[PDB]
Amino acid sequence: SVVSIPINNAGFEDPFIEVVDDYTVDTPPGWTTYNPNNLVPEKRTTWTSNNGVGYVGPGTQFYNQLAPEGRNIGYIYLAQKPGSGVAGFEQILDATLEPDTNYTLKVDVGNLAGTFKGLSFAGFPGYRVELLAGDTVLAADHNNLFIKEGEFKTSTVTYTSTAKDLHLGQKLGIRLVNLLQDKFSGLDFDNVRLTAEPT
Amino acid sequence: SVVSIPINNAGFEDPFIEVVDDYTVDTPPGWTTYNPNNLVPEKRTTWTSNNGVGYVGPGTQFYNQLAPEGRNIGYIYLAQKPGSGVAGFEQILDATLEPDTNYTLKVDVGNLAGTFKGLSFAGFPGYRVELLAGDTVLAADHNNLFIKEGEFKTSTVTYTSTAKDLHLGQKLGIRLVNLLQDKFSGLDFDNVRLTAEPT
Numbered sequence A, B: 001s002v003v004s005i006p007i008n009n010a011g012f013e014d015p016f017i018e019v020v021d022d023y024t025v026d027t028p029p030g031w032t033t034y035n036p037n038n039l040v041p042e043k044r045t046t047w048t049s050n051n052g053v054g055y056v057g058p059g060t061q062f063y064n065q066l067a068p069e070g071r072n073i074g075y076i077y078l079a080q081k082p083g084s085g086v087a088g089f090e091q092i093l094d095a096t097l098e099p100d101t102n103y104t105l106k107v108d109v110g111n112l113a114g115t116f117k118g119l120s121f122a123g124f125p126g127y128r129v130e131l132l133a134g135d136t137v138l139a140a141d142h143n144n145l146f147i148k149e150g151e152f153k154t155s156t157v158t159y160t161s162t163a164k165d166l167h168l169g170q171k172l173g174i175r176l177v178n179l180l181q182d183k184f185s186g187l188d189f190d191n192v193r194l195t196a197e198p199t
């Protein structure tokens, strides 16, 4: 029946983070920075556009629940103004597109809440989750879920291949995208899962 | 409490077409040609990149059913090779984006079967349905449905505004896109519906 497709660091649990609400500002291992508009610098600091992992643990000040999975989430934060472009995470998989298969891609998407000393996390940039083969977006969920301040929700993306799909044999891939359509312009992702089932 | 947002020629019934499977090759009334990659020329023939309306009535060569709604559908056909770009239909509405409102866009999407002038309609280019405010895509369904050869299915796109949405007061819009990701690379749309409801 259903087969689980392996993904590296699928719940962003590497690296380990000791202190609740702490976070890194480098690309998490197993992933790459999707950067089509060059918004995220090679060298990041507290003060730049950045991505990384963050510990959403007991006593977090910024959510009304914990990480969907384990300790950590993956986040993308953009400093540039709304409409400047998009960025996020990308992972190309070893699995290839096979014919007469239903693919289901699930990812949790989180909306950071609250304030800190004049800083405000109110609002949300929009998200898109993409399933790729090669560099083709086969299917994507472009911001269809409403995500309340301080909660996560599961996005579901589906593609069904045919006997004669043009992209057959190409490497499957995943992209988790910050749309930068409004601010606060950070968002969190967690618990990436991909399954495949013969139609 | 649910309110219908008016759309012009929402079912592509204008213009009336007398003979089953006959069609126009010009932009349907009430719509514009979405053409970001310049795939569709200003003057069209049968078999050039084009769009139009077609009559899907009793004894159509292309479906196992009649049009989702009334007589007609709106089609977009792209002659160029896969990867060349996208094109379709756009309509800017008079309604504007309002706060704390749940928007639901539904569109029927058709995978043509059969044969036409000795060409197989086997295969499908992929679709995307978009809800806009101004020139921003608020939410979109990028090709998540599996549509069998010779059937229509309903795409649903949803967006929820907040009190402080950046695009509040901007004009709502709809785009119906042919993705040109595979061949046969034409597809049909019908029965565009958009509703709004206070959250």
Ligand SMILES: NC(=[NH2+])NCCC[C@@H]1NC(=O)[C@H]2CCCN2C1=O
Pocket (backbone or CB within 6 Å): A021, A022, A023, A054, A055, A056, A062, A073, A075, A112, A116, A119, A186, A187, A188
């Ligand atoms: N879940 C995230 N995306 N990141 C971790 C929580 C927010 C993160 N940690 C903090 O302590 C607050 C201080 C204000 C800025 N913050 C941050 O950027």
Ligand SMILES: NC(=[NH2+])NCCC[C@@H]1NC(=O)[C@H]2CCCN2C1=O
Pocket (backbone or CB within 6 Å): B021, B022, B023, B025, B045, B046, B047, B048, B050, B053, B054, B055, B056, B062, B073, B075, B077, B112, B116, B186, B187, B188
């Ligand atoms: N699309 C329909 N259901 N009916 C109209 C068929 C004709 C319409 N116009 C054309 O020029 C041909 C090109 C190939 C596909 N076409 C079309 O879809």
Ligand SMILES: [Ca+2]
Pocket (backbone or CB within 6 Å): A011, A012, A013, A067, A068, A069, A070, A071, A072, A073, A190, A191
């Ligand atoms: Ca996790």
Ligand SMILES: [Ca+2]
Pocket (backbone or CB within 6 Å): A111, A112, A113, A114, A121, A122, A123, A124, A149, A150, A184
């Ligand atoms: Ca927020």
Ligand SMILES: [Ca+2]
Pocket (backbone or CB within 6 Å): B011, B012, B013, B067, B068, B069, B070, B071, B072, B073, B190, B191
């Ligand atoms: Ca119709």
Ligand SMILES: [Ca+2]
Pocket (backbone or CB within 6 Å): B111, B112, B113, B121, B122, B123, B124, B149, B150, B184
């Ligand atoms: Ca077909």
